[PDB]
Amino acid sequence: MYDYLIVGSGLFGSIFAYEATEKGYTCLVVEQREHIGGNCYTENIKNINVHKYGAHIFRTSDQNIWDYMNQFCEFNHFINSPIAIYKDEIYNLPFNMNTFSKLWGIKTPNEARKIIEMQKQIIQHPPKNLEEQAISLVGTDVYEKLIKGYTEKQWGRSCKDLPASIIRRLPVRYIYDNNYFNDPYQGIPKGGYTAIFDKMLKKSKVILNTDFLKYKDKFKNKAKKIVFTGCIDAYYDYRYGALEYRSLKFEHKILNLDNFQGVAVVNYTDKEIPYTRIIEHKHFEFGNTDTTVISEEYPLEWIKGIEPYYPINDEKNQALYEKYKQLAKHESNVYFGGRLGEYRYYDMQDVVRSALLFCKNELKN
Amino acid sequence: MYDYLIVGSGLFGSIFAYEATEKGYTCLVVEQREHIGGNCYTENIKNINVHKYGAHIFRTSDQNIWDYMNQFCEFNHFINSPIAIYKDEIYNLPFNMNTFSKLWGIKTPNEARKIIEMQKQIIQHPPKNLEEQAISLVGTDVYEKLIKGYTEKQWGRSCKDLPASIIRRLPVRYIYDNNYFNDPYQGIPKGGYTAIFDKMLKKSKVILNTDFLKYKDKFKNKAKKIVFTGCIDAYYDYRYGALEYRSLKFEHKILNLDNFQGVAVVNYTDKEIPYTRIIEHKHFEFGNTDTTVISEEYPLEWIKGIEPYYPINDEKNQALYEKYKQLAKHESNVYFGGRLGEYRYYDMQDVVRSALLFCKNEL
Ligand SMILES: Cc1cc2c(cc1C)N(C[C@H](O)[C@H](O)[C@H](O)COP(=O)(O)OP(=O)(O)OC[C@H]1O[C@@H](n3cnc4c(N)ncnc43)[C@H](O)[C@@H]1O)c1[nH]c(=O)[nH]c(=O)c1N2
Ligand SMILES: Cc1cc2nc3c(=O)[nH]c(=O)nc-3n(C[C@H](O)[C@H](O)[C@H](O)COP(=O)(O)OP(=O)(O)OC[C@H]3O[C@@H](n4cnc5c(N)ncnc54)[C@H](O)[C@@H]3O)c2cc1C
Ligand SMILES: [N+]
Ligand SMILES: [N+]
Known part of the structure; x- marks a missing residue:
């Protein structure tokens, strides 16, 4: 049994996985895709780091966030x-x-x-x-x-x-x-984004090609707490x-x-x-x-x-989301995070901030 | 037509089977597994009696229960x-x-x-x-x-x-x-638990590898009464x-x-x-x-x-069991017993006490 089950190996899940394992907690990361990194995933193709799910340019006005990501990579001066x-x-x-x-x-x-x-x-x-x-x-x-x-x-x-x-x-x-972008800090990770996730997930057990929802009960029982970064509505069977x-x-x-x-x-x-x-x-x-x-x-x-x-x-979807969120608030030891878990567009700096804030409140000893 | 159809060859089923046959009743025992004994079943593997369904250590404070089991075996002094x-x-x-x-x-x-x-x-x-x-x-x-x-x-x-x-x-x-265990009587039967069930079921017709509910038609009016030691909810098709x-x-x-x-x-x-x-x-x-x-x-x-x-x-499941219990009280010529028939965890001693008490009122 693990301390944490993390569904999704994107920016939110990987940052939490890294922070938790650094503090001695055991983490099982379950990912449905054949690779880690979520939508920030880059694939090396013909010696080029390809942004598979769209252009991803990192930027922030927060030096703490910039300094945090610099632990895992060096950014170039791409504008x-x-x-x-x-x-x-x-x-x-x-x-x-x-x-x-x-x-x-x-x-x-x-x-x-x-x-x-x-x-x-x-x-x-x-x-x-x-x-x-x-x-x-x-x-x-x-x-x-x-x-x-x-x-x-x-x-x-x-x-x-x-x-x-x-x-x-x-x-x-x-x-x-x-x-x-008007931000003072901007750039692209040298070597691609995926290498960052490799570092973050090094101390975690990562399972790929696995839809958590197809094995919901099996995986819930494998950990004391669950951090779900997939679609919140999907978790509750839509x-x-x-x-x-x-x-x-x-x-x-x-x-x-x-x-x-x-x-x-x-x-x-x-x-x-x-x-x-x-x-x-x-x-x-x-x-x-x-x-x-x-x-x-x-x-x-x-x-x-x-x-x-x-x-x-829009209004009707926010109303729908709040219904799901109300279910979440009453399900102990299950937490929803990330763009999919919170039904909102997150810039990368925004999810880094969101993930780290969650880490500060969740991770103790 | 048999006097009794006994579904399950565990402790409850086998004790009743023994007592009934001893008092001259015909007993048909239908067991879904490849062997008898229920969860007390031991298999001899490399000359070791293996407790296949978990460690089973008999203990009791009732000398009567202890003496009863001693009829079929000798207990060692395992602590x-x-x-x-x-x-x-x-x-x-x-x-x-x-x-x-x-x-x-x-x-x-x-x-x-x-x-x-x-x-x-x-x-x-x-x-x-x-x-x-x-x-x-x-x-x-x-x-x-x-x-x-x-x-x-x-x-x-x-x-x-x-x-x-x-x-x-x-x-x-x-x-x-x-x-x-704080009990004055405790130990493991020498030779395993399965040998005990062998003796109890000796005078009974035993059918193995047969799920009674799966083939309920094949056992229509084959016996006067039915003693069911399987799941009570399953008997009533959930x-x-x-x-x-x-x-x-x-x-x-x-x-x-x-x-x-x-x-x-x-x-x-x-x-x-x-x-x-x-x-x-x-x-x-x-x-x-x-x-x-x-x-x-x-x-x-x-x-x-x-x-x-x-x-x-828990509360939800006890409320559920009580519904099935009420059905059972109206089911003529059908009796439910054992851990599964009564939805209760029973020590082996509890089943012996429970089985014998049922034998007292039925036989
Ligand atoms: C088109 C486009 C382009 C960009 C951007 C978004 C979009 C939509 N972004 C935002 C960036 O993509 C975003 O911040 C991150 O993806 C958020 O990380 P998450 O962990 O929140 O989710 P994300 O979607 O990355 O990760 C979630 C992970 O969970 C997995 N998952 C979901 N359901 C599962 C299940 N049932 N079982 C197992 N695994 C499951 C997914 O497979 C995925 O790997 C961006 N930001 C920026 O700062 N600059 C930029 O240029 C861009 N560009
Ligand atoms: C893991 C574990 C450890 C235990 N340890 C101890 C211990 O150390 N000491 C102790 O005193 N007790 C222990 N017990 C308790 C103990 O095993 C019970 O007392 C005992 O199993 C009860 O006998 P029973 O006949 O009522 O149930 P069972 O033993 O389960 O007998 C039921 C039989 O009915 C059969 N059956 C069910 N459905 C059907 C069907 N549809 N058709 C045909 N047959 C069917 C089953 O296959 C089974 O053979 C333990 C129990 C468990 C589960
Ligand atoms: N533990
Ligand atoms: N706890």
Whole structure:
């Protein structure tokens, strides 16, 4: 019998596993996939660390969190500066002067601001939908070329058919600066993410290719306490219904050339282009090989049983989640954590913070 | 047509079978297993009588019961004195001065009593769980070393997530004495338990490898009365649901050495070790052979259909049993007995007393 049974070997489960075993507790980690790491998992393909479940760029404003992850790796100086392709046009992300000079053929911050403000102001009443919402935030030109088609692919319907709540803010900076994240600490682990999980899970017993739910009673009996980082609704047999998600599908391709797109991340904002993004993984670690691996990111219509990527978090799903959470609060020695256990989108720094806080309260002697 | 159809050849079934045949009644015994004896069954393996379904040590304070079993066998003078292994440590059971001197490095009865009674007092309220219940009775040290891990494995969860009712009492004696049982009569039948059942069932027709419920039609009106020692809920097709049990799995191993652990019963009381006990069977009859048969005893998850070892006997299941008991009181010419027929843990002596009392009223 173990001290802890941990379901899932992602960032939350692995950090807890590491912290618990460092304090002398025994941990059994049960993982359904054929590998560890969760959605942060990287696979070495043709000497390139491939972000299998989408681009993962670590960033934080918390030095303690940054220092924590540095125990397991060294971060390079990768700066995310994504490119957006719209039909035959190409723009810099995030919305900055590089974007604005290209869009309108202007040069000064005042020129850009004048156009942004005049275009935002065509909306003179509270937005009735997502289209009016986005326009009220950044104006028509930015919306049509950089937001509209991309969003309609992600959601599978017109922005006029979508609620305004989906986009709360759209930051604009009047500086020539393509730095996507404003955080002081940013980078990619040298050697990939998976090696971090190897270190975290070294003192744990890890079982792969095993769905905990297919052996629920068997595994519960193997430990005194359970940390579940899978879907909370799935743990409770979806008895109240499945918490709604949006999904994705990645098509990975090995290409016989050294440099496909010249940047790690390219957004395709035209609705007629089926993929939302193309990821060229070698640029994450400044790779110098004669071949490259790219991943085409496709929206995938979600239903129960399909990979849960982005939680919806609307009112009805939050109400549903609170019902499951109430079940959880009354099940002693079973704890739910992570993006799936708490039905929320966690940045990596957010789950590190969440995991460590749980560790501080849970782990004693 | 037989006088009696007896389902099960365990202690209850076999005693009734003996008494009935002795008084000139015809008895048909239907047993689902490949052999007789029920859970008391011993198998001769490498000239060692192996207790196949767990260590079975007969004991009683009733001379009558003891004298009754002596009709079928002779008991040796085996004294049960289990050893408890916790991590790198080793202790004597039951809780006595040998235990206490090892635990605390003390020597006198009063030195031990002072510690135990001081440690017991950290629980000032009614125990909210099994952990507090154990601690309230024997203190933290005894609980952590000899009860905690052992219990966690048996139930698959922490003791503070278990009800206090699981442990009724934990006797403590301030004497240097490793005698596990306080009974004046105790021992192991020479030649094994199976030989006893052989004698009891000699005048009965015995059918093996036959699940009565599975083939109930094949035994329609083949006897006037039925004595059922199987599960009472199973007899009634689980009309109200299944009575809950805990189960066990034994891994029997043969080793080429004369003495594996130097005692019949070793309890493993830390949760890390998967088995709860290791039984070295040759010590029950003071074996002298050059090989030994041991059995690792594992707690096994119970669902409906799994071998029923220990009844839960909580409120939910007692309410369930009472429903089935009421059905039985209206079932003409059918009687239920034994641990399974009555959903109760019985010592062997209890079954003998129970069987004979039924024989008194029926025969
Ligand atoms: C498309 C996309 C892209 C990114 C990101 C998310 C998404 C959806 N993230 C967020 C990042 O992925 C996230 O922080 C972690 O996955 C969270 O770690 P967890 O342990 O919470 O879950 P995660 O989903 O990683 O791990 C859960 C694990 O549990 C397992 N599991 C589930 N059910 C099971 C079962 N029944 N039995 C056994 N195992 C089971 C799963 O297989 C999985 O391994 C990110 N963050 C950031 O800071 N920068 C970034 O660039 C990105 N990019
Ligand atoms: C692990 C363990 C350790 C024990 N240790 C001791 C001990 O040290 N000392 C002690 O005094 N007692 C001990 N006991 C108690 C003890 O074994 C009982 O007293 C004894 O088993 C009771 O006999 P019984 O006939 O009532 O039940 P059983 O012995 O189980 O007899 C029942 C028989 O009926 C059969 N049966 C069930 N269903 C059907 C069916 N549908 N068709 C045909 N046959 C069926 C079974 O196969 C079985 O053969 C222990 C019990 C266990 C479980
Ligand atoms: N406990
Ligand atoms: N233990």
